[PDB]
Design a protein around this ligand. Structure first.
Ligand SMILES: CN[C@@H]1[C@@H](O)[C@@H](O[C@@H]2[C@@H](O)[C@H](O[C@H]3O[C@H]([C@@H](C)O)[C@@H](O)[C@H](O)[C@H]3N)[C@@H](N)C[C@H]2N)OC[C@]1(C)O
Ligand SMILES: CN[C@@H]1[C@@H](O)[C@@H](O[C@@H]2[C@@H](O)[C@H](O[C@H]3O[C@H]([C@@H](C)O)[C@@H](O)[C@H](O)[C@H]3N)[C@@H](N)C[C@H]2N)OC[C@]1(C)O
Ligand SMILES: [Zn+2]
Lengths: 87, 96, 208, 25, 216, 98, 118, 129
RNA sequence: GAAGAUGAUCAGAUACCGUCGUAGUCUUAACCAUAAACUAUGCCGACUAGGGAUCGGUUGUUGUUCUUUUAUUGACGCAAUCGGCACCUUACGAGAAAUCAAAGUCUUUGGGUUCUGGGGGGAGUAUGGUCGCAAGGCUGAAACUUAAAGGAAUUGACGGAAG
RNA sequence: UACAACAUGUU
């Protein structure tokens, strides 16, 4: 949200669901935010480095969070041959 | 859906349907039947004059108990008989 | 990404197959379709094992990404996961909930049993409905051990595994704990074994 | 009044009102 | 002498969390009104209705008093609280608490040109509660708040200057009217506009990057 | 209001059903609605079983079984405790008791 | 009847939790001990507490009872909770030499690129 | 029977959008549906959509990106003067800065801002925002 | 078994209960056209969430019973579909709620179309018309009167209701 | 077996 002389006046830019692109509201207490540790080649985690996935209450209540995270993770390289596009 | 036609050449149906159902509204039906002209005691006038025929007291309805002073009046323009309340304390003695 | 070092080592297949993990429930849900390998003459469905394994790895990375380890909550109402969750809490420093989950432990903030975990790890989504239902109120992600007939509402990560069997539940919890220790650094490497023998974590009968 | 008998009362009334009418065309 | 009982309250008192927008961004449940009145100091309350509700017993009615309160900073934050207590004063105090705990951010916007600061809503929104539906519509500059007194007070304490209103249903049910208007005015941060299409990376919650000062 | 989704009978899929007469009061009642009981009872009361066994000519001779099916109107079924008024959440139970 | 109220029951529970070794199975000795332990302000209440405590002790002897947590049971319930068998159950020694899995799981594992003997 | 295939298509799109679906199957297709979908795609409200030939009428699979609130038809296709577009945009559109009223004009199917640029008008077709 | 006659109960019962019993109940040929004629939910079309059954048709298939022990047997058993009568869970979404997979996709209001309602009464009355042998059906006002009538749910109280 | 009804108006 801009004005004439380019100053942003948005109070805060809210997060959106990674699976459905829906805005996660300030009272959306059923929404989560997964954080998954990224692993170095030894096999150990990494200090304070993650990729985080946001889900809204709607998908979690529809019982679709598992498949959505399967897709997102496997498409970011964190999974293989679990989620399949053809069914 | 919605139970009303939406076709772009359906103006006649819409207008006639509104015209039929406006008869269900009391004000429209009164002003198109002309009931004030034909059946109102005053004939549509705001005021009317008449001759007092008798004084009558009318029992107030529940949960009140009183005698509301009124006069039986015969109108001049049409000869109709109506009952009118005479409003204030002791104002019935002013009318005869 | 992730190296080619995890790869469901055949000893892990030993442990899973001996513990009868792959024995899915006779009736499966639409949300559990990408987990069944096929059906068998008895009727029960077979759960894919590589899927289970790398879901365990994903879950373990979720636990490992968390700050102070007590913020991970493990729980089981069923009388097969108390020992497993207590052993996991001991070997990971997390917080366990065995037996009864008092309705209000997550939302009622004046109880002297108030807890604010960052993650809820649960044995059975159905028999432990209260914990998941309450996590939905306060924004807590849930990692669940789901069978083929377990409901999937209000779960983020599902580990597909037979959650009816004693050895199955104990083994799944044990592998989660071992993965978490390897990731944290307690266990030096995949080749290194563990001082904890597999038949630990396994709930014993209270009658000998 | 059990509206059923209210209608029955009107039927008998309306039956008789039709007798008085036919008495004088 | 307040001492926090929740991680968010602990972080608020320590100064780790300095803004409400730090909380809304991650959807942190707020259970302590001290968080609100530290983060949002200047706040104006307004009692909107006091009504008596009654329970029938074998000895007589049991009269309790229900109060309705609207809280707001006139700068994009507004809250609504309802509470029933045996005395009017206690009911109003508890309703102020409930109103503070429910404060939400409001998206202000422009009706036409974007001279100056936002003065109206970004889009048409509606809220429903019971039979009542309240619709809030962007209005040009120079229009006041075209609304009934209760909705007007809510809009003023929200910080809105230009808005059209149109209600439907039993608006005399003041609690339902205010709840519908509260649901409406909060939907401005749920209707996705093209200017919010641009993805922003998912940041880390303060309760993550301060997860030792929050433990105790 | 509407008490039951089945309207207190079993008639989804048709217009009309022939009536039956109540066992007690001979009330015409739709068959799909009548409360119906299938009773098997012993033709001789138990306390006389051994007395009739003694008095019988035969040896190893079975006892005939009484069969009948009973139909009740709702009033004559409630007044006989054959069914009883249940709660709102317990009305929705078709599974027999135990 | 004589149903024990909540005050006496909770008093007895805390006596057992906090002084289990001292308490005995005798009502008179329990009386003289509860006089020393707690500060009941009535002879009758002291007696009811002590006697119900004696009854609780006489029950506890025949196995643990759920509700009491003196710092003696946890020792057994913990050192018995570390029961680590010398012979494992998940090894393939117990089942002679073949994973006793039906052909369906056999084909399953053959699909996972394993050479497993079954 | 089927009286507006555009209505069925846009309803299916909206229903799939509300359920969180990434993709929606449209049947049957038509030139008007394709032009409308092209208008919605050029503004980013939809992704790639693909046309299947069944030798009968066609099917369309659409990639929904989750950026769409509402698509619908205005039926009947009211005649619109050049300066009666103002009321339609006021009544159908969330605000004066986003959303489109799709018109079919003798210059082709377009949105209302393009119609103002070209100073053309015709019959209303639908809306998207 | 309406009506009627008659015995009881009863303060009275020209009622409930008992005994008869005329029309009627049945059929043929004609009338009548109304029911809580109800799912109190118009019809056509599209889409939206899970599950297990059942009826009809068709399509692939056994450690089963029957012909024969064997077929081109029949029944039964296991998976797919098309059509149905329905049912179960949840609450997406709806609703004033009761509740609803439609009563959803409706202030983010527009797929096509028919009918109906506009506070309660007076009143489905009067009148004209029309159909009917009649009983009656269909069409169908106004004067006048009135501040509520009504819906769903809550707490209580009460029941010749249950535990 | 039998069991009918409870003057008006409020605070
Ligand atoms: C005596 N009151 C009448 C009332 O009977 C009713 O009148 C309708 C009248 O509106 C109908 O007529 C109506 O509907 C027809 C439609 C069927 O085509 C239209 O063509 C016609 O213009 C329209 N007036 C007429 N066909 C029957 C009367 N009973 O509504 C009007 C009224 C004056 O209230
Ligand atoms: C002989 N049969 C009678 C039949 O004549 C009729 O009776 C009416 C009766 O209803 C009228 O009664 C009427 O008038 C009374 C009275 C207080 O004003 C009021 O209750 C009210 O206006 C109305 N019921 C009465 N005024 C005349 C009888 N012929 O209705 C009752 C009945 C038994 O069918
Ligand atoms: Zn009966």
């Amino acid at each position: 949200m801009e004005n004439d002389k380019g100053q942003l006046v948005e109070l805060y830019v809210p997060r959106k669901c990674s699976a459905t692109n829906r805005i996660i509201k300030a009272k959306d207490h059923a929404s989560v935010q997964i954080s998954i540790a990224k692993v170095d080649e030894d096999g150990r985690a990494i200090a304070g480095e993650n990729i985080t996935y946001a889900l809204s209450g709607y998908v979690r209540g529809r019982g679709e969070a598992d498949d959505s995270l399967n897709r997102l993770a496997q498409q970011d390289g964190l999974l293989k041959n679990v989620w399949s596009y053809s069914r | 859906g919605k139970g009303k036609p939406r076709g772009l050449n359906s103006a006649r149906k819409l207008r006639v349907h509104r015209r039929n159902n406006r008869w269900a509204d009391q004000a429209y039906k009164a002003r198109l039947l002309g009931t004030a002209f034909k059946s109102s005691p005053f004939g549509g006038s705001s005021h009317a004059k008449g001759i007092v025929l008798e004084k009558i007291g009318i029992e107030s309805k529940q949960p009140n108990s009183a005698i509301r002073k009124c006069v039986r009046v015969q109108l001049i323009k049409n000869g109709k008989k109506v009952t009118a309340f005479v409003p204030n304390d002791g104002c019935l003695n002013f009318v005869d | 990404s992730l190296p080619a070092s995890f790869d469901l080592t055949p000893e892990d297949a030993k442990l899973l197959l001996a513990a009868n993990v792959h024995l899915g429930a006779k009736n499966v849900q639409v949300h559990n379709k990408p987990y069944v390998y096929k059906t068998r003459p008895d009727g029960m469905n077979i759960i894919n094992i590589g899927k289970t394994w790398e879901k365990i790895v994903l879950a373990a990375r979720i636990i490992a990404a968390v700050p102070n380890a007590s913020d991970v909550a493990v729980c089981s109402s069923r009388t097969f996961g108390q020992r497993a969750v207590l052993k996991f809490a001991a070997h990971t420093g997390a917080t366990a909930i065995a037996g009864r989950f008092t309705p209000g432990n997550f939302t009622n903030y004046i109880t002297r049993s108030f807890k604010e975990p960052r993650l809820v790890v649960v044995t059975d989504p159905r028999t432990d409905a209260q914990a998941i239902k309450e996590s939905s109120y306060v924004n807590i992600p849930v990692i669940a051990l789901t069978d083929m007939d377990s409901p999937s509402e209000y779960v983020d990560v599902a580990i597909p595994c037979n959650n009816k069997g004693k050895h199955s539940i104990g083994l799944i919890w044990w592998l989660l704990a071992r993965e978490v220790l390897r990731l944290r650094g307690i266990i030096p490497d995949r080749t290194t074994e563990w001082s904890v023998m597999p038949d630990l974590y396994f709930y014993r009968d209270p009658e000998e | 009044m059990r509206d059923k008998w209210r209608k029955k009362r009107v039927r008998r009334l309306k039956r008789k009102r039709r007798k008085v009418r036919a008495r004088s065309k | 002498g307040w001492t926090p009982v929740t991680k968010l309250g602990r972080l608020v008192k320590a100064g780790k969390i300095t803004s409400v927008e730090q909380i809304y961004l991650h959807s942190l449940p707020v259970k302590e009104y001290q968080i609100i009145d530290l983060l949002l100091p200047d706040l104006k309350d307004d009692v909107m209705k006091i009504r008596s509700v009654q329970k029938q017993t074998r000895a007589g009615q049991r009269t309790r008093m229900k109060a309705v309160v609207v809280i707001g900073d006139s700068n994009g934050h507004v809250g609504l609280g309802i509470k029933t207590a045996k005395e009017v004063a206690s009911a109003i105090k508890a309703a102020i608490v409930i109103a503070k705990l429910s404060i939400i951010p409001i998206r202000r916007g422009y009706w036409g040109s974007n001279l100056g600061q936002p003065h109206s809503l970004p889009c048409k929104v509606t809220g429903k509660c019971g039979s009542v539906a309240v619709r809030l519509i962007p209005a040009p500059r120079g229009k006041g708040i075209v609304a009934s007194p209760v909705v007007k007070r809510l809009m003023q304490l929200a910080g809105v200057e230009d808005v059209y209103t149109s209600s439907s249903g039993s608006t005399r049910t003041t609690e339902n009217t205010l709840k519908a208007a509260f649901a409406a005015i909060g939907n401005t941060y749920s209707f996705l506009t093209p200017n919010l299409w641009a993805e922003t990376p998912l940041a880390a919650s303060p309760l993550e990057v301060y997860a030792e000062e929050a433990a105790a | 209001p509407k008490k039951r989704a089945s309207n207190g009978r079993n008639k989804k899929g048709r217009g009309h059903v022939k009536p039956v007469r109540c066992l007690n009061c001979a009330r015409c009642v739709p068959k799909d609605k009548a409360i119906k009981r299938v009773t098997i009872r012993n033709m001789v009361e138990a306390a006389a079983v051994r007395d009739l066994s003694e008095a019988s000519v035969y040896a190893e001779y079975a006892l005939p079984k009484l069969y009948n099916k009973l139909h009740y109107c709702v009033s004559c079924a409630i007044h006989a405790r054959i069914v009883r008024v249940r709660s709102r959440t317990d009305r929705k139970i078709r599974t027999p008791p135990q | 009847g004589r149903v024990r109220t909540k005050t006496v029951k909770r008093a007895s529970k805390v006596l057992i939790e906090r002084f289990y070794p001292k308490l005995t199975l005798d009502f008179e000795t329990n009386k003289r001990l509860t006089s020393e332990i707690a500060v009941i302000q009535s002879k009758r209440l002291r007696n009811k507490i002590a006697g119900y405590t004696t009854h609780l002790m006489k029950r506890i002897q025949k196995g643990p009872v759920r509700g009491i947590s003196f710092k003696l049971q946890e020792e057994e319930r913990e050192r018995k909770d570390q029961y680590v068998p010398e012979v494992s159950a998940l090894d393939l020694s117990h089942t002679n030499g073949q994973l006793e899995i039906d052909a369906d799981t056999a084909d399953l594992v053959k699909s996972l690129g394993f050479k497993i003997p079954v | 029977t089927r009286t507006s295939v555009l209505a069925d298509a846009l309803n299916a799109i909206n229903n799939a959008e509300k359920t969180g679906k990434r993709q929606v199957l449209i049947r049957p297709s038509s030139k008007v549906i394709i032009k409308f979908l092209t208008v919605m795609q050029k503004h980013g409200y939809i992704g790639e959509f693909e046309y299947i030939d069944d030798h009968r009428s066609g099917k369309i699979v659409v990639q929904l990106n989750g950026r769409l609130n509402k698509c619908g038809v205005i039926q009947p296709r009211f005649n619109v003067k050049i300066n009666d577009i103002e009321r339609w945009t006021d009544n159908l559109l969330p605000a004066r800065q986003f959303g489109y009223v799709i018109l079919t004009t003798s210059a082709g199917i377009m949105d209302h801002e393009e119609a103002r640029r070209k100073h053309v008008s015709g019959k209303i077709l639908g809306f998207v925002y």
